[PDB]
Amino acid sequence: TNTVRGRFYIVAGIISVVMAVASIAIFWWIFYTITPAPAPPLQNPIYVNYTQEPTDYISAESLAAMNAYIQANPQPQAVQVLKGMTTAQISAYMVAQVSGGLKVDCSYCHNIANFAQQDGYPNAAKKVTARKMMLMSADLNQNYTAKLPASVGGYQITCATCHNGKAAGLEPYPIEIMNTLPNDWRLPLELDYPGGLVVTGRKDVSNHEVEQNQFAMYHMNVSMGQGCTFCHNARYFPSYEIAQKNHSIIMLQMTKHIQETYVAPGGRIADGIMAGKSPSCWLCHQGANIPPGAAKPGQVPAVLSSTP
Amino acid sequence: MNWIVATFMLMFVLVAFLPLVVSLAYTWVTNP
Amino acid sequence: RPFEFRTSVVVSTLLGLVMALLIHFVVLSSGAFNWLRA
Amino acid sequence: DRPFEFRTSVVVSTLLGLVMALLIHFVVLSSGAFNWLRA
Amino acid sequence: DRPFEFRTSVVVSTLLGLVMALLIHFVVLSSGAFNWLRA
Amino acid sequence: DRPFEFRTSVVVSTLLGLVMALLIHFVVLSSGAFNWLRA
Amino acid sequence: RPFEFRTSVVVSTLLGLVMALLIHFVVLSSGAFNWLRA
Amino acid sequence: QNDLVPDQWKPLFNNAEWLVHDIVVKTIYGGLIIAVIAHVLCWAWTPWIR
Amino acid sequence: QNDLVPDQWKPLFNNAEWLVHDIVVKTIYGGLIIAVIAHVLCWAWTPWIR
Ligand code: BCL
Numbered sequence: 278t279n280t281v282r283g284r285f286y287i288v289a290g291i292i293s294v295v296m297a298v299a300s301i302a303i304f305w306w307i308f309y310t311i312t313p314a315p316a317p318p319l320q321n322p323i324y325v326n327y328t329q330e331p332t333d334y335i336s337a338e339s340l341a342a343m344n345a346y347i348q349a350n351p352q353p354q355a356v357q358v359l360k361g362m363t364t365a366q367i368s369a370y371m372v373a374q375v376s377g378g379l380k381v382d383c384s385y386c387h388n389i390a391n392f393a394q395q396d397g398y399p400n401a402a403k404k405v406t407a408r409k410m411m412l413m414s415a416d417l418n419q420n421y422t423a424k425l426p427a428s429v430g431g432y433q434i435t436c437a438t439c440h441n442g443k444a445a446g447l448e449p450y451p452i453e454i455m456n457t458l459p460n461d462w463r464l465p466l467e468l469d470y471p472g473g474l475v476v477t478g479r480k481d482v483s484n485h486e487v488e489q490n491q492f493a494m495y496h497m498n499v500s501m502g503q504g505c506t507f508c509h510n511a512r513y514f515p516s517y518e519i520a521q522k523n524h525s526i527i528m529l530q531m532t533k534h535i536q537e538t539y540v541a542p543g544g545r546i547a548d549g550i551m552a553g554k555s556p557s558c559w560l561c562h563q564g565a566n567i568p569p570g571a572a573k574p575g576q577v578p579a580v581l582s583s584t585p
Numbered sequence: 586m587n588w589i590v591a592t593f594m595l596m597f598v599l600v601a602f603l604p605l606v607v608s609l610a611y612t613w614v615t616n617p
Numbered sequence: 618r619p620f621e622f623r624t625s626v627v628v629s630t631l632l633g634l635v636m637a638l639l640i641h642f643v644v645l646s647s648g649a650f651n652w653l654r655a
Numbered sequence: 656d657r658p659f660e661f662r663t664s665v666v667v668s669t670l671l672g673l674v675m676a677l678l679i680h681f682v683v684l685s686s687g688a689f690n691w692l693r694a
Numbered sequence: 695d696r697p698f699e700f701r702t703s704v705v706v707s708t709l710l711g712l713v714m715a716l717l718i719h720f721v722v723l724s725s726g727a728f729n730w731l732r733a
Numbered sequence: 734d735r736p737f738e739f740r741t742s743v744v745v746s747t748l749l750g751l752v753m754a755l756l757i758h759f760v761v762l763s764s765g766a767f768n769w770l771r772a
Numbered sequence: 773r774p775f776e777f778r779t780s781v782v783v784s785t786l787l788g789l790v791m792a793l794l795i796h797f798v799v800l801s802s803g804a805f806n807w808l809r810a
Numbered sequence: 811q812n813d814l815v816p817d818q819w820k821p822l823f824n825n826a827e828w829l830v831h832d833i834v835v836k837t838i839y840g841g842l843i844i845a846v847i848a849h850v851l852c853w854a855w856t857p858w859i860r
Numbered sequence: 861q862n863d864l865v866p867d868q869w870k871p872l873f874n875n876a877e878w879l880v881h882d883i884v885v886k887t888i889y890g891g892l893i894i895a896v897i898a899h900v901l902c903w904a905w906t907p908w909i910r
Pocket residue numbers: 629630631632633634637644650652659663664665667668671679841844845846848849852
């Protein structure tokens with residue numbers, strides 16, 4: 278108080294405190310001044326978090342031929358899957374969802390001069406595979422996503438799911454998601470669910486099986502963008518008190534079905550419609566609990582939805 | 586997240602380290 | 618030997634260096650200015 | 656007696672300069688603004 | 695007296711040079727810019 | 734008196750040479766450029 | 773003496789044994805030779 | 811040794827500490843001037859308040 | 861001891877520390893010159909402010 282030492286100590290303390298708080302204040306003022314605000318998510322009336330636009334991959338001649346065909350044909354001429362739709366509705370679907378979920382041109386699969394032509398041009402195999410992928414989508418969301426309750430939202434599987442704006446070169450297991458895992462681990466789809474990855478209390482099992490369980494479980498919670506507690510109460514992992522675990526059982530059955538029926542039907546790759554590329558949880562869920570390419574209810578041709 | 590309250594709380598967590606550091610410095614200074 | 622002056626100057630230098638680094642990284646990662654762009 | 660020894664100042668300045676040189680080189684290399692070791 | 699010893703400076707310089715040479719060789723090998731050791 | 738002792742220099746040189754020999758041999762072996770020990 | 777003969781002998785013996793073991797392990801793991809195949 | 815240091819701060823500074831303190835304050839003033847110039851140039855480049 | 865040190869810096873620098881300090885300042889000057897040339901050449905190559 279009387280000496281210079283005490284006055285210096287008091288002044289130093291107050292200066293240090295005010296300098297610290299002012300440093301934090303100016304740091305955050307500058308930060309909030311220059312840093313832009315994050316962009317709000319998409320408000321597309323079809324997709325959850327995905328957009329078809331800009332539609333620059335579709336040329337002008339394609340649109341002109343589409344308009345001419347609609348004018349000259351009020352009803353479809355040769356359709357085997359898309360039933361109960363006029364040419365206008367079929368063309369709207371083929372612009373918004375087909376060729377907008379793959380981001381390609383109408384000439385990728387069709388012949389521009391005649392949209393009803395089946396063969397005679399070098400891109401007929403693309404149209405065949407597209408029809409088979411329509412039938413697969415119908416089956417998939419007709420007897421696998423129709424088992425989920427209404428509290429999830431009622432979203433549909435469409436072309437932009439599993440594709441995300443690419444035609445070929447799809448990567449179910451990218452290198453970005455192999456961060457803590459060996460870069461050859463794949464989802465064990467040869468097992469039966471429920472029961473394929475149960476380890477608790479079993480005396481015919483050891484730490485090798487627990488490791489194989491943990492690889493799949495970390496894949497799951499990277500694919501959801503969540504922690505382990507999204508599907509579990511961590512005080513007892515066998516418990517089924519969170520509904521996401523039942524949702525995940527249904528989705529494991531669906532992905533095993535995709536592997537058995539469409540990737541390697543009958544055990545041989547040559548008969549599948551996919552280039553031997555096995556599915557994963559990440560292929561649809563790109564780090565979110567609802568896939569960005571999923572269609573909102575009522576936005577998918579009724580023949581390819583869960584309602585029939 | 587506020588990011589301004591979190592930084593002050595982080596500073597409190599860090600300033601909780603100070604007495605041990607002063608103990609080490611006192612031991613070093615007083616034993617030449 | 619008094620410990621006040623050396624401690625004060627050391628803590629001041631450390632604060633200045635840390636603050637300069639933090640502000641530079643914050644400005645760089647914001648994109649407001651051209652600076653190092655591809 | 657002296658507030659600072661010359662040896663400590665030299666050591667601190669050398670270490671700080673080396674660390675800063677490495678940091679700037681890595682930041683500029685990672686930015687991608689210059690060609691440098693491409694291919 | 696002397697602020698520094700010659701032995702300490704020699705040791706520090708040798709260690710720094712060796713570490714720097716190894717680091718630069720590793721970075722250049724991993725970059726892929728030069729042919730060098732290719733299968 | 735003497736800045737460096739000869740024995741320590743001999744020991745350091747020997748260990749450094751051995752380490753470098755091992756490192757370069759393993760780099761060249763695993764690179765796959767030379768035939769050497771194959772299949 | 774600046775150099776002790778015992779230390780050099782011990783270091784040489786240990787280094788020779790370690791190098792021989794290492795070379796044997798690398799050469800057997802290589803798979804180039806038809807040596808101890810089931 | 812307490813010489814060339816004013817009596818007000820003699821219980822705190824020596825003469826060597828006085829010289830070091832003088833160097834420090836001169837450095838601070840130079841840095842402040844350069845910082846002001848830098849901010850003026852950056853504002854002339856791209857204003858951050860609009 | 862305090863023989864080559866100027867009278868102003870006697871309480872700070874020894875005889876050896878003065879020579880070491882001179883070497884250090886000459887090194888810093890050379891490094892600054894080289895850094896200026898390097899920065900000019902890099903700006904000629906690719907400007908980093910647009
Ligand atoms: C868009 C943003 C602009 C930009 C806008 C600004 C603005 C605005 C400012 C700067 C400032 C700075 N900029 Mg800039 N700057 C840009 C890009 C860069 C790049 C780069 C590679 O791109 C670099 C390297 C820099 C670097 C710098 C520094 C020269 C300076 C920070 C001073 C400092 O650190 O004080 C803090 C450092 C300390 C407190 C410690 C330093 C003291 C010494 C070095 C420590 C050792 C000495 C001692 C003897 C050792 C012993 C200690 C004890 C005695 C024992 N800028 C871009 C182009 N820049 C600031 C400045 O002050 O200008 C001069 C400033 O205001």
